[PDB]
Amino acid sequence: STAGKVIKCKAAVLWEEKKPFSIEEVEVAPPKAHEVRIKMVATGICRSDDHVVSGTLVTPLPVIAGHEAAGIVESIGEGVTTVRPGDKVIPLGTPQCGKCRVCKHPEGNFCLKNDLSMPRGTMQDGTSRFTCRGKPIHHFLGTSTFSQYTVVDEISVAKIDAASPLEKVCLIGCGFSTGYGSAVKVAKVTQGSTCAVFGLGGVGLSVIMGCKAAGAARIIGVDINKDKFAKAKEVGATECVNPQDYKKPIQEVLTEMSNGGVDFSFEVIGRLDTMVTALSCCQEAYGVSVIVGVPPDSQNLSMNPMLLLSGRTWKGAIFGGFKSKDSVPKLVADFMAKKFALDPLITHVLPFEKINEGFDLLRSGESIRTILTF
Amino acid sequence: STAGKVIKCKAAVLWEEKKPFSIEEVEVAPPKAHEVRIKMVATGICRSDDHVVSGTLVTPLPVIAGHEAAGIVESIGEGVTTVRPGDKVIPLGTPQCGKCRVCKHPEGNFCLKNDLSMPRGTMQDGTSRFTCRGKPIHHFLGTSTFSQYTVVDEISVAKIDAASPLEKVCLIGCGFSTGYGSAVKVAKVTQGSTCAVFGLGGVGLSVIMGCKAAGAARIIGVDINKDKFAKAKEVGATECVNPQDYKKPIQEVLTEMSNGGVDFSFEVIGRLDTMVTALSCCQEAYGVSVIVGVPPDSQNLSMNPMLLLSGRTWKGAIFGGFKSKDSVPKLVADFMAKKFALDPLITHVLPFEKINEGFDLLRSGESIRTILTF
Ligand SMILES: NC(=O)C1=CN([C@@H]2O[C@H](COP(=O)(O)OP(=O)(O)OC[C@H]3O[C@@H](n4cnc5c(N)ncnc54)[C@H](O)[C@@H]3O)[C@@H](O)[C@H]2O)C=CC1
Numbered sequence: 001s002t003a004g005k006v007i008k009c010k011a012a013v014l015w016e017e018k019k020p021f022s023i024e025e026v027e028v029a030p031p032k033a034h035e036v037r038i039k040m041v042a043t044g045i046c047r048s049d050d051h052v053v054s055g056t057l058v059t060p061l062p063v064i065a066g067h068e069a070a071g072i073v074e075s076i077g078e079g080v081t082t083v084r085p086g087d088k089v090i091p092l093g094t095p096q097c098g099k100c101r102v103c104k105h106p107e108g109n110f111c112l113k114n115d116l117s118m119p120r121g122t123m124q125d126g127t128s129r130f131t132c133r134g135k136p137i138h139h140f141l142g143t144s145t146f147s148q149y150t151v152v153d154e155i156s157v158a159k160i161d162a163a164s165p166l167e168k169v170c171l172i173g174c175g176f177s178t179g180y181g182s183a184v185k186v187a188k189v190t191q192g193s194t195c196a197v198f199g200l201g202g203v204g205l206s207v208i209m210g211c212k213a214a215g216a217a218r219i220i221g222v223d224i225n226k227d228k229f230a231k232a233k234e235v236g237a238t239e240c241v242n243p244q245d246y247k248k249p250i251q252e253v254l255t256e257m258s259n260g261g262v263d264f265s266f267e268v269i270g271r272l273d274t275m276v277t278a279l280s281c282c283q284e285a286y287g288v289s290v291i292v293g294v295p296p297d298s299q300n301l302s303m304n305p306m307l308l309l310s311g312r313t314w315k316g317a318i319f320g321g322f323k324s325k326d327s328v329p330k331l332v333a334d335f336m337a338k339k340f341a342l343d344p345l346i347t348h349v350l351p352f353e354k355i356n357e358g359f360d361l362l363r364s365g366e367s368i369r370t371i372l373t374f
Numbered sequence: 375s376t377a378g379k380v381i382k383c384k385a386a387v388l389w390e391e392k393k394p395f396s397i398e399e400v401e402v403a404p405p406k407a408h409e410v411r412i413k414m415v416a417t418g419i420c421r422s423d424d425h426v427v428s429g430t431l432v433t434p435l436p437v438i439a440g441h442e443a444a445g446i447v448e449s450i451g452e453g454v455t456t457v458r459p460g461d462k463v464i465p466l467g468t469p470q471c472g473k474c475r476v477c478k479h480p481e482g483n484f485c486l487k488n489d490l491s492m493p494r495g496t497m498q499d500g501t502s503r504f505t506c507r508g509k510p511i512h513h514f515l516g517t518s519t520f521s522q523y524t525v526v527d528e529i530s531v532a533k534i535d536a537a538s539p540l541e542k543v544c545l546i547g548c549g550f551s552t553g554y555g556s557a558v559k560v561a562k563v564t565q566g567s568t569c570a571v572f573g574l575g576g577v578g579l580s581v582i583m584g585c586k587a588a589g590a591a592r593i594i595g596v597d598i599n600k601d602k603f604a605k606a607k608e609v610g611a612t613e614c615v616n617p618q619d620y621k622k623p624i625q626e627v628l629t630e631m632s633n634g635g636v637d638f639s640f641e642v643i644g645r646l647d648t649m650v651t652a653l654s655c656c657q658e659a660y661g662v663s664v665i666v667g668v669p670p671d672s673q674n675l676s677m678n679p680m681l682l683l684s685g686r687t688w689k690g691a692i693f694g695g696f697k698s699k700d701s702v703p704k705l706v707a708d709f710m711a712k713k714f715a716l717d718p719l720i721t722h723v724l725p726f727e728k729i730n731e732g733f734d735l736l737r738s739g740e741s742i743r744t745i746l747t748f
Pocket residue numbers: 045046047048051174175178198199200201202203204222223224225228243268269270271274291292293294295317318319320365368683
């Protein structure tokens with residue numbers, strides 16, 4: 001019926017920065033060799049998608065954004081061996097080619113086939129599968145899930161349990177796994193430790209979930225929006241602090257609260273100043289700080305290297321350190337076995353056609369994750 | 375003979391920055407409770423001592439510097455239980471009180487009793503044991519080894535093997551242990567890995583020794599003084615590069631040489647620019663960079679946090695991460711069992727009276743470690 005043919009469908013096209021998405025018809029080419037065309041079922045609104053709109057995260061425009069999603073395979077290109085039509089799948093904003101030095105390394109996950117370091121906004125072959133008004137449109141992170149259909153390279157898609165609820169497990173494609181893995185895999189939070197989490201959105205709440213799963217004794221949530229505190233406590237925060245409530249810098253406050261610095265801190269906002277504050281608030285001799293938030297494009301932070309010389313460890317990670325294709329199906333299986341919850345992250349549900357309202361909810365501070373249904 | 379009495383002896387006093395040391399008579403008070411008075415036998419010239427002269431490292435003046443040394447206990451104050459008169463000892467620029475949260479933590483070593491974070495230049499009790507021309511003189515790092523006799527707090531001294539050669543093992547008090555541990559304990563260099571070591575002085579050569587002991591396959595030494603390359607290769611470097619020989623930034627050179635970035639890099643100079651270069655040259659997804667060098671006082675570096683977000687780990691350490699009082703005697707025992715060599719680090723041996731000549735040798739690029747003998 002549609003296999004081998006161009007599909008005309010609706011997508012949310014971003015023609016320029018700082019403008020609403022345009023819901024309009026696009027043409028989606030059939031998949032070439034080692035490509036997969038997916039009928040989207042649900043997609044979450046991640047702050048990184050908003051960073052594309054705001055220019056915080058630079059990728060070529062015009063673009064179909066979206067990268068946190070789940071759908072059903074409509075057709076596969078020649079040579080595809082890991083998914084078949086009808087399979088439930090999660091696209092992966094970080095691929096897993098399985099062949100590069102990073103994929104072969106026991107710890108690495110930032111596969112060298114990624115489209116983040118030097119963005120092209122294309123498929124792996126350097127071309128686009130999307131046309132709109134006769135104009136080629138860029139892809140985003142090899143995923144482009146703000147469309148009723150997308151085409152992704154095989155290395156950027158994972159087959160998941162056929163019974164998965166796609167309107168929930170789409171969060172495993174980005175925000176949940178990123179936050180959870182940042183705590184359990186990247187930081188390796190220890191039982192009885194004290195953690196500080198800067199930023200209590202969908203990703204920060206998932207960091208809290210991971211800290212609690214790791215057995216932290218104290219988990220201090222930090223946010224300038226106190227409306228975020230109730231949910232943070234529900235998922236495991238033992239206390240929350242708003243930096244605006246204090247006359248001293250919050251790194252001082254947190255050092256005093258933790259009797260000399262926290263064991264693990266996480267920056268899950270995307271500001272240069274909070275990256276330095278989060279590093280400073282961990283204990284100077286043995287603390288660990290993990291950057292999760294995305295900094296504004298091309299901007300440098302300033303910091304005193306004595307913060308590191310005393311013994312601190314500072315690291316960052318994409319996607320919680322998880323090797324994407326290996327990890328996503330296992331994380332879905334864990335979700336199906338009730339080993340973590342996703343409902344606390346989902347505050348709003350909207351049809352895809354209301355994407356702009358979903359972004360308004362995020363920008364106003366009212367939502368954690370809005371899930372869009374196609 | 376001298377016990378309980380003020381000792382008049384020779385010391386090298388630094389009265390002000392950017393001046394030669396003044397070799398003259400000082401008075402060394404007897405040890406108070408939990409203090410140890412030590413007759414010096416040998417002391418090394420570490421770049422950190424020169425940093426005091428140059429103003430790179432700020433500590434109260436006038437001062438008796440020196441912190442890498444070995445000697446023999448002359449007398450002990452009330453309550454001392456860990457050393458006795460006649461014992462061979464190494465003073466510890468980082469103490470090990472055994473009671474603070476850092477000393478109790480399995481990884482931490484930067485004991486909260488240190489005199490580095492907020493330098494006072496005193497004994498633990500806030501007073502000085504040194505007088506010169508009737509003026510009180512400050513201590514340095516709780517050690518002050520540029521003197522025929524010094525007084526140190528018990529938590530800043532380790533008893534070592536009575537058969538130890540003090541003119542060699544003084545290096546275990548700072549330089550050697552710092553570099554070796556930075557590789558084996560802080561970075562945890564792995565078998566078959568590629569390492570880059572910036573700075574080929576006494577500490578950087580000790581990093582190379584540690585990388586080789588850990589089984590690194592490639593160890594790239596980096597120094598602007600090509601005269602340092604021969605000794606670096608003798609102790610394990612597989613190749614050396616001088617940034618001044620290249621038109622491109624050395625981080626780009628090292629990334630190309632390592633086919634995409636090194637596994638472990640070490641900054642063992644003390645420059646902001648080389649700290650950022652060393653971080654950048656490690657592989658972006660799984661590389662680890664360790665700051666060992668001391669930055670100039672109060673200066674901040676500038677860096678792009680995307681270097682960390684992709685997956686790099688950045689850390690620093692004092693004294694190679696070793697808990698000082700536990701580790702120094704074991705490292706001496708290891709040296710006595712031929713587990714590592716110290717002779718490659720020692721290029722000059724001079725009488726203490728030639729301290730200024732020893733510093734000239736360091737500043738001119740002509741020495742690795744000069745050992746001063748009393
Ligand atoms: N490393 C990775 O793989 C990933 C990174 N990201 C990044 O993580 C960050 C968080 O993403 P979401 O949770 O979706 O965003 P979000 O916008 O829902 O949450 C951010 C939170 O930070 C708080 N905040 C903002 N400014 C603050 C300040 N100055 N001090 C304290 N709190 C402040 C906000 O009130 C908000 O609750 C974003 O920068 C996003 O781009 C997201 C997904 C994956």
